[PDB]
């Protein structure tokens, strides 16, 4: 909320540029003048209470992981400190590279080479499973929350070092806590249908993330609940009967079916740009297919019967990493 370059925060950090913006506010690269000049990333949070207590939660999550895993072994972003600055909350992070979304974005939305996807997939899975081990759900996993450590590339840009870290913990919730409904192009189905969530909804996102690394685009491109539900079914097949029945938000559930118009102009938009999952493959080579096996397991409709990351890390697709 209106900052600028060359500025100084809390008499220590000097803004050099802006790494990105969001509804919460922004992230800037600074020079830390009281730590020898190290570049760091600083998250300045708009002074709206909604974002202010998200930030406060985030700080306690970040402090938990940071003490439990001070080595960043499990690759969750490291918080260096926080402060207040004219009513704005500021969180200081280790400085990292581009988002995976941003990197793809500036590469013509070319996808990642499968061997890079594998190492990325492994680290995300391993990192979030850590959160999962500690009674935490991220709820907000997306390609934009996964950043390369160094995002240098050769060039059709080829990424040098696919090492990543997992970042935004504003939304992360403990099991010991009340389970929200916030708002998003990667929400699990047990989330849209207001049926309760927990660790298995992180796994859903990871599936969606891995389709995107593979194709270079998303396959659930709509911030509309109905459109999404229909996309889900064209790609993954029929929604389980029981979930449709035991849903509080039983608005678009007519005669126990999805009350969507396959016949409407908007319907054709859903059909014209979505096919069954396995039709998205671009090779039928063995390792392409191990991957889609994993993705299909991750995209199981029933969170109760959905693969866990503890399992996912043992899947065939990762064998070459061993
Ligand atoms: O939320 C965090 O924990 C969080 C923590 C660290 C970074 C971050 C978000 N976002 C960066 N980039 C970014 C890119 C686009 C939009 C926005 Cl808002 C931010 C970034 C860059 C370099 N080093 C650390 C970070």
Residue numbers in the entry: 149 to 303, 313 to 340, 343 to 481
The authors write:
CLKs are dual-specificity kinases that are activated by autophosphorylating their own tyrosine residues and subsequently phosphorylate the serine/threonine residues of the SR protein. Later, CX-4945 was revealed to have a strong inhibitory activity on CLKs; IC50 values of 82.3 nM (CLK1), 3.8 nM (CLK2), and 90.0 nM (CLK3). In order to elucidate the selective inhibitory effect of CX-4945 on CLKs, we determined the structures of CLK1, CLK2, and CLK3 in complex with CX-4945. The overall structure of the CLK catalytic domain contained 12 β-strands and 10 α-helices that could be divided into the N-lobe and C-lobe, which are typical forms of the kinase.
In this study, for CLK1/CX-4945 complex, we used the CLK1 protein containing a single amino acid mutation (R431G) by chance. We speculate that the side chain of Arg431 might negatively affect molecular packing during crystal formation due to its flexibility. Moreover, the mutation point was far from the active site; thus, we speculated that R431G mutation was unlikely to affect the active site conformation and binding ability of CX-4945. For the β-hairpin insertion structure, CLK2 had a complete conformation, whereas CLK1 showed a partially disordered loop. In the CLK1/CX-4945 complex, the carboxy group of CX-4945 directly interacted with Lys191 located in the β4 strand and formed water-mediated interactions with Glu206 and Asp325 in the α1 helix by hydrogen bonding. The 2N of naphthyridine ring interacted with the main chain of Leu244 by hydrogen bonding. In addition the chlorine of the phenyl ring interacted with the main chain of Glu169 in the β2 strand. Val225, Leu244, Leu295, and Val324 of the C-lobe and Val167, Val175, and Phe241 of the N-lobe interacted with benzonaphthyridine by hydrophobic stacking interactions. CLK1 had the smallest and CLK3 had the largest pocket size. First, the active site of CLK1 was somewhat narrow and contained a negatively charged patch.
